[PDB]
């Protein structure tokens, strides 16, 4: 018989589901909601400067803990200013709960609702106190079940409406007969394949199925490969991945193994023609088994309403235990050996600088990367996780994602890599580190250029950018910046950054135009063909 | 048949069609799918190509350029993230009747799934017309149709160009197709409007946004003199008819404005809204504050009054029809300035308040400086700008979205032929898009920017002062200007403000950033009236 | 460069797609649209008395010619009063285009739009002249592709807006590889089955695939059976159906053949637990092949975007020609031999009366039946088609459907059978026959009872209805009515009705309570078990 | 009509607001000067009070007003048509109203009237009744 303000019921429902913080920027229509969030302290409230960062930070927080992210905005400009970040979270299967303030029920372009419907899997306007609890459960349940963003619009006069507490997600029971048929066909297909391959992908991480999938991989007995967004999965498994598939720029043997498989089990994979993703045009659709978005497709036919977790358990029930292991193999060889001299800096030198510290005893940091050669370089860095817009490829994610991740990392420092073009977009969010109580290390790749674009159209003058003095601007926003031009300066700056806590550390690495990471070089050489 | 032989690339035809319609530049940020299009733009130089740092600024700059010259604005982006990142700026342009032509690159017609097309569906919600130029034979007519729609309704439009179509040969783009015009309804409407104006006890003519967008100032000045009723402007009509025989008594902006003007408008029993946006946000004329039953609303090519709506009535046509029915008049209602601008800055050791910034600017003008056009962001900077003498004011007065300020000043100055722009912006808004100033050197511009730094989202504090989240940190913006190629100075006293403003005006060639420290709780007079007016109700 | 009023463009688009008439009831918001319809004469405009009849008549017209039906109503009460008829058309795969007038774009509960979205497959509010042509093509195209109702809302101020003519339906090209895979699996399943059965169902008729399916049936070589809504299909085919499956009340051999099949090919079937339909709980889901709603499901997996027509052509390409025929068999035995004496009337006597006339030389008439024992009786009548709510089971369809069908029959007379309860609902629509220029024969089964309900709960008094003198009321609404109590009177009345053209003929047959048709008797006996 | 539409203090105590048929329309009155008490809320002066039952608002107003013996009764405001001319002329809707009213004036206790939508409703407005039930706002037949 208890009841609470609608806003409080929502905040508690989010916390009940694992949310760790709420990022946001208020406005008139959202002020009452922000007041409840601040006064109740149910979720830590972190504000940022610009809405893109609110969305990227919530996305990063969701990815960091494989839970719900929370992004709060105000009606109109505020919400429209987060459309790109939300689209990116949708694209990369990250459940960001977008909460927008809205005009009261009694109160220029609804357009906003229509736009958000295009980039979320469920929406609700909480304008009826009696049904709000069920609607919140339905919408948050969809976010969790599909691992994609959702939209909640709260009229300002409803924030304080009394409602009953939010219950559990509505349960959608799987058809046992269909699941059995699905598991049987999938297993039969893997057994009939001359070259079966198990790809561990994004949904495995999002749904927290790492342990179950490590077990499945051991029992299935086929080669394991990860997709870009599955990087690091099963690293501690009995049969760790042979490597990561990233398309033309990756290991040739891995690329062929994936593309020539006649039993390619895409366990939770996002398919697209984007650079690093598994593309339908490069694989055998007559033999691929795509388990994704609560469905399983093979031989052009689909089993509906098959959650990934259920499929994995069904396969385990049909497989005998195994003690097989492949861990006696040699570990991956990362680029190391930075020559700390007076020579200029190349992207690979940044990778070597980071890797050398790790080899010398530094526990690796999780890396947040923006889109650009910084990402191609980060791929060769030893990390405690990599968070980047590898498929969506939108710029601006980097710095805000590092900030969002460190806000929920419980003390673990984050390393962010970002190019000059991307920094001009959202790097300024670092001015918020002092209030947030964080101190990320940021390596800014400054080549005074939109280099990825120059690489593919070198004759154009518009890719030449001005020389912005980012390191000189760091103090103005509360951080310690240093511009480095030589490998010796780079080595020294990285050590100093790790030795200095309390303020964000910005290392502005000057890189000449035309100098690329090894992976980007291979990508370019690959396209030419 | 597939076109062949025109020796004109689709992209070139589009750039030329835009130039034919008055476009003065193209702002944009490239990406893979848009590279071929940007190559044509750069190589042909049909329109000056200006790049910016972040897409919001591309949209705001294009919007500002459109507003500055009452023409088409052009914003070029790449498919996906690039385009989605400009949705807010485009929605703002739609909201304030500014024709921004959005041109997005797209996958080639024979190419090919991360979302769910999603992009087209989103843009269709914030534009008046759209076209995917994937058929060279139909491209010319589609361009004319879409650009024609932008000009007919003064709203943004969307053009999506598959990258393999950029260089496809096409025939030249013709003129805009004609929109419906009901001559019979026009005549009947004109008669009814005049009858309503004549019978009203307190009629009022409001000169609004469409009058400026459609270049009707001269015709409306003539109409105002002949109609013989009190004249007032809306926020977006501010400045119109200033030199006319019957100039506006003032600008209506709701409770925040002059009490006499507000009363005149809200008590009118014959309110003729000539081209007005009707909305309940910020400074817009609100359907909830006036009596729609006694209102004549001419907008979006229609006219509503007496419980009925006349369709297919272009504003220019209605004005001409009214003039044909009114005899000439020598009526003159000019007099000494209606709105008294604050002057007399006390250049001493006291802290700075928003009104001191208005006095500093106004004193320079009164001393002989030709006023600059002002670009303002949303915040107390806008409320303060209402009391500044200007050569035009560009701001999100209705949409109220932050981030517009600095990019708008940049876009306007790119097309101003050297006329310097004065930008006013708060600390919260500068944190969003003020960084775009780093592009001034390459763009060859040097705007003056007054940053109101109260370490606060102050407008929100006025609405909910109990909240701690409106307190912002100390950002040393002036100290960051050099890294962006400009001159910055932080000022704390009125004397420092006076000196810095003079130095900024005396120094061209580099943008000038004056970071004015202002205490929390100190508001412009207009924002103070706005806040008090809210409480009263 | 030509353009026309939006309303005219819609009417022509409907006529282009085969629509033969428009049924409707106007109101303030729809008056301008009705004016265009009346003045242009593009489609004959037929008004009725009450909206249920408008919907049932449009549904019947659609069914009669396997084309689009058109039902025009006014905003509010008018449209809400047609929700049941539209739901029934949706339930039975009939493409009724609902056109509602609406407030002008510049102008108590939108609720109406939301309600119609629940019972239609596509909707559009034509409030933008520039996009109206494409929206009309999209919505009408959905009606044709899915064979279900659609909704078009036209603001009154848009009726006369100038628009470009409507083009063709947007084309949704089928994936050739998926179709090939589907056809291969289906054919392999039919060949591996020990008892394959081809069921010809509603979509075969709706999409005009009778000739193609007759060919498929001959080449496939398996037994053919029809569903209730497939009654009469392939009657003239090389291998006509062995019979019609209608559940427990049908032929035992047919019921078992269907239910025990391990290769049940449901070609275009509506599945449901309703009386006469094929139910998922009575068949083997591990062996059923369900081709319906543009998909094909077997073994719990589904091939998407497979139009029925495409599937049939794909199977024909994989089957060799055949000269096989089963037409040497004995035809169906219908009840005949009415004893025209002084004894009371039973439902089977009505069937015998109708069948005897046919055996004596009368070309059979298409029969429109309402829900009740009249339908169970009609199942044993020789017809030129049977139109009834066999699956939806909603009352009131009968008389209006007969009226709608005769409006588009090009001179062919229609026979309607209806119970007293159903007649009290919509039988009054017969008052419109004079204006419509039609003269259907209507046999009203009057047992002063909701007999189907008494059969299952005989102890209830509320199923006892009063004695309404329907025949006595016929003249008041322009028809010739006669009440008959004996078999001799029945025989004479039916002959007189057929001999009298110009006015509807109402034969009110008095039937005692407790006297049922043979099929209903079997149904009841079946449920008991 | 003039009294209502020109009012600068229109207190709508429990009114349905709609533009259909006989309903009070937001387009005919000045909402700025209207006090709308309906659906357990009260709207006026550009703001809305929530959770206000109509019975509660009435009681609260009574508590703030002193008793009064004010009386504004007078001879019937609406003149009902009477005097049916019972002759050979055809029937018009007003004749039906006169027939009904004449019976009442002659001593018949009025009956409650149920009316459908159509001129029957417009005619019933001029009939003496013991209540009138009709779809006056919804206008459904
Ligand atoms: C929001 C957004 N706008 C534009 C692009 C197109 N784009 C892809 S790479 C690139 C250049 C990035 O420059 P930078 O951040 O300096 O890294 P670099 O290419 O020099 O390594 C651009 C503009 C994008 N991906 N996202
Ligand atoms: C894109 C966007 N996000 C949020 C808001 C809500 N908002 C309106 S005023 C304001 C504070 C502005 O702070 P500032 O720029 O420092 O100017 P001040 O109010 O202090 O004068 C905010 C966040 C908005 N209008 N637009
Ligand atoms: C619209 C609707 N309302 C109620 C029912 C429930 N119902 C099914 S059969 C029946 C009785 C029909 O009586 P009648 O038309 O006289 O035919 P009978 O049963 O006597 O053969 C009823 C009320 C229905 N199917 N449809
Ligand atoms: C269910 C429904 N359908 C259609 C209408 C539209 N309508 C309003 S008045 C009218 C005509 C009513 O005719 P009638 O009952 O004979 O009364 P009359 O207008 O002749 O006085 C119609 C069809 C409606 N209000 N309700
Ligand atoms: Cl993946
Ligand atoms: Cl305006
Ligand atoms: Cl069927
Ligand atoms: Mg760069
Ligand atoms: Mg501020
Ligand atoms: Mg009966």
UniProtKB/Swiss-Prot annotation, chain B:
Catalytic activity: indole-3-pyruvate + H(+) = indole-3-acetaldehyde + CO2
Binding site for Mg(2+): 427, 454
Keyword Cell membrane in annotation: no
Organism annotation: Azospirillum brasilense
CDD domains reported for this sequence: TPP_PYR_PDC_IPDC_like (cd07038)
Domain of life of the source: Bacteria
Coiled coil stretches, renumbered: none
Keyword terms of this UniProt record: Decarboxylase, Lyase, Magnesium, Metal-binding, Thiamine pyrophosphate
Family: Belongs to the TPP enzyme family.
Residue sites binding thiamine diphosphate per the record: 55
Annotated spans, Thiamine pyrophosphate binding: 380-458
GO CC annotation terms, alphabetical: cytosol
Record-listed E.C. numbers: 4.1.1.74
GO BP annotations, alphabetical order: aromatic amino acid family catabolic process to alcohol via Ehrlich pathway; auxin biosynthetic process
Necessary cofactors: a metal cation; thiamine diphosphate
Gene Ontology molecular-function annotations: indolepyruvate decarboxylase activity; magnesium ion binding; pyruvate decarboxylase activity; thiamine pyrophosphate binding
Pfam families: TPP_enzyme_C, TPP_enzyme_M, TPP_enzyme_N
Chain's gene name: ipdC
Free-text comment on the cofactor: Binds 1 metal ion per subunit.
UniProt pathway annotation: Plant hormone metabolism; auxin biosynthesis
Name under which the protein is recorded: Indole-3-pyruvate decarboxylase
């Amino acid at each position: 018989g208890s009841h609470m303000k609608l806003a409080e019921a929502l905040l508690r429902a989010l916390k009940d589901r694992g949310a760790q913080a709420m990022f946001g920027i208020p406005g008139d229509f959202a002020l009452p909601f922000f007041k409840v969030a601040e006064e109740t302290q149910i979720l830590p409230l972190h504000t940022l400067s610009h809405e893109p960062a609110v969305g990227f930070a919530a996305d990063a927080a969701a990815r960091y803990s494989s839970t719900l992210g929370v992004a709060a905005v105000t009606y109109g400009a505020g919400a429209f200013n987060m459309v790109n970040a939300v689209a990116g979270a949708y694209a990369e299967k990250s459940p960001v709960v977008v909460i927008s303030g809205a005009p009261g029920t009694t109160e220029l372009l609804d357009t906003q609702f229509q736009v958000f419907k295009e980039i979320t899997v469920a929406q609700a306007r909480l304008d009826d106190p009696a049904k709000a609890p069920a609607e919140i459960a339905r919408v948050l349940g969809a976010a969790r079940a599909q691992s994609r963003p959702v939209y909640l619009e709260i009229p300002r006069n409803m924030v304080n409406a009394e409602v009953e507490p939010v219950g559990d997600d509505p349960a959608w029971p799987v058809d046992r007969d269909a699941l059995a048929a699905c598991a049987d066909e999938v297993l039969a297909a893997m057994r009939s394949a001359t070259s079966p391959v198990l790809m561990v992908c994004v949904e495995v991480r999002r749904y927290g199925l790492e342990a179950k999938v490590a077990e499945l991989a051991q029992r299935l007995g086929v080669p394991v490969v990860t997709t870009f967004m599955g990087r690091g999965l099963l690293a501690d498994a009995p049969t760790p991945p042979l490597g990561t598939y990233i398309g033309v720029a990756g290991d040739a043997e891995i690329t062929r193994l994936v593309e020539e498989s006649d039993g390619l089990f895409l366990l939770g994979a996002i398919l697209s023609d984007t650079n690093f993703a598994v593309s339908q045009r490069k694989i055998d659709l007559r033999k691929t088994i795509h388990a994704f978005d609560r469905a399983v497709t093979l031989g052009y036919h689909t089993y509906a309403d098959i959650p990934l977790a259920g499929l994995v358990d069904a396969l385990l029930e049909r497989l005998p235990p195994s003690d097989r292991t492949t861990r006696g193999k040699e570990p991956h060889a990362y680029p190391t050996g930075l020559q700390a001299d007076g020579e200029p800096i190349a992207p690979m030198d940044i990778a070597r600088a980071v890797n050398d510290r790790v080899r010398a005893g530094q526990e690796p940091l999780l890396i947040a990367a923006d889109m650009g050669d910084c990402l191609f370089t980060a791929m060769d860095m030893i990390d405690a996780g990599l968070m980047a817009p590898g498929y969506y490829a939108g710029m601006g994610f980097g710095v805000p994602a590092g900030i969002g991740a460190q806000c929920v990392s419980g003390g673990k420092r984050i390393l962010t890599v970002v190019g000059d073009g991307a920094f001009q977009m959202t790097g300024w969010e670092l001015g918020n580190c002092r209030r947030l109580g964080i101190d990320p290390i940021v390596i800014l790749f400054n080549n005074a250029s939109w280099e990825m674009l120059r690489t593919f159209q070198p004759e154009s003058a518009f890719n030449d950018l001005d020389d912005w003095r980012f390191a000189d601007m760091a103090a103005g926003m509360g951080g310690d910046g240093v511009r480095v031009r030589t490998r010796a300066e780079l080595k020294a700056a990285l050590d100093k950054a790790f030795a200095t806590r309390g303020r964000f550390q910005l290392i502005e690495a000057m890189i000449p135009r035309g100098v690329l990471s090894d992976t980007l070089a291979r990508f370019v050489q690959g396209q030419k063909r």
